[PDB]
Design a protein around this nucleic acid. Structure first.
Lengths: 244, 244
DNA sequence: AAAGATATCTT
DNA sequence: AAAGATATCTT
């Protein structure tokens, strides 16, 4: 399927190549920065062609946001099935070592999940799937990346700002957690686990219906939440009380 | 001066090279997406080696943030002048059509300007200058050919998601405005004006102390600013009256 | 954790 | 505009 084809392609492209700089049209190469800010942009652009290659193979048109601050990164759809849209978002995070726990910010909990058309390329109810492509990189210990430019013949002298990268494709609801991923920008948090749990889809939600109800009713501050719910057990206790 | 040299080199480099994609170590080239999050990453990375070369020629050490969430992008300083550090921040915004009014978000107003060591590489009282390297780009819409990989020989054929990049170097207090640049993330807003006003420094503050005083007392929301002040006139009246 | 930082944009 | 969206990080 599109999903298994896309998953294999992602593993493969990641296995073959290591992005290492930005290139001018004149052939001048600039080394990469050290942040997730720089790497989330890089993994994003690295995934574009792969996604597009695979969607076209399965008959899906690919649309990116036309306006900024609209989810998702990639909207896949056959024109014969306008309500079978698939949402693909690239998310990046880091590890200090290759064996620690990671966590992702999985998108707002107050935009398109509480309002059909808010900050979303197409109305939320037109999407039947919401996949996350997750990139995990291990930071390099050095905090002093190249400060000079390179030529095309020097590509292997360019220090890369990561020592290892891993990628997974998973449904957003499966890896969602019950703790916010951000405070002022109200983001759903994923589980806090090892990379394999993400791949294996060992979430805390029992259904996507439960994932959505939880984030749709989750209060923004600690105060409001202490009178309702802070985690999955308390939400399950809140359902028992009559949603009160 | 460092500043005259730095701006000439920025202006010269801008006019001579054009970023057109990210490259892997293997030589495979990935085109650029159109959102400003991409273009701000690229302009950041394009400026790094220029800044570094010019600082070096003036005997300035260049230090980049050791932790994310820390201003500024580039801290310049001499070992002989530890308290005369120079902060350089790269800011990027767009224009729908070449030469319309633009605005920038100029950093939090509730972090290092209200707390000497908050989210800043070095205590804020060791910096004597805060420079903004501002980039303006005219947005060019993404197309088909941007969703495939290119090779080094096709470097001149890759569609770019921007046009007419202009660059300026200016003091943050000089282009600073009196309306917030963002709500929930409490950022200072720049003046809302044409490119030439940034170059020439046609801001609204009479001094850097006023800028600082205005932004260290600006309230976070409209309701809280109703009482106090929402713009420079009102701040000058509030000042006139005795800060009440 | 929770709350608010990091940069910039839309409505 | 003001306010709260875009993504992720610290602390």
């Amino acid at each position: 399927s599109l999903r298994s084809d896309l998953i294999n392609a992602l593993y493969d492209e990641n296995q073959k190549y290591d992005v290492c700089g930005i290139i001018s049209a004149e052939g001048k190469i600039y080394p990469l920065g050290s942040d997730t800010k720089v790497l989330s942009t890089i993994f994003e652009l690295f995934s574009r062609p792969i996604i597009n290659k695979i969607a076209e193979k399965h008959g899906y048109i690919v649309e990116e946001p036309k306006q900024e601050n609209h989810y998702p990164d990639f909207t896949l759809y056959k024109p014969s099935e306008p309500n079978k849209k698939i949402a693909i978002d690239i998310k990046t995070t880091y590890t200090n070592k290759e064996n620690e726990k990671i966590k992702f910010t999985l998108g707002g909990y107050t935009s398109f999940i509480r309002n059909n058309t808010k900050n979303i390329v197409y109305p939320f109810d037109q999407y039947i799937a919401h996949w996350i492509i997750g990139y995990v990189y291990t930071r390099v210990a050095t905090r002093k990346s190249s400060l000079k430019t390179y030529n095309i013949n020097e590509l292997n002298e360019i220090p890369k700002p990561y020592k290892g990268v891993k990628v997974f494709l998973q449904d957003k609801w499966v890896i969602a957690g019950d703790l916010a991923g951000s405070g002022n920008t109200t983001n759903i948090g994923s589980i806090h686990a090892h990379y394999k749990d993400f791949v294996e889809g060992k979430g805390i939600f029992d259904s996507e219906d439960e994932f959505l109800d939880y984030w749709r009713n989750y209060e923004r501050t600690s105060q409001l939440r202490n009178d309702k719910y802070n985690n999955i057990s308390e939400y399950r206790n809140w359902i028992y009380r009559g949603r009160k």
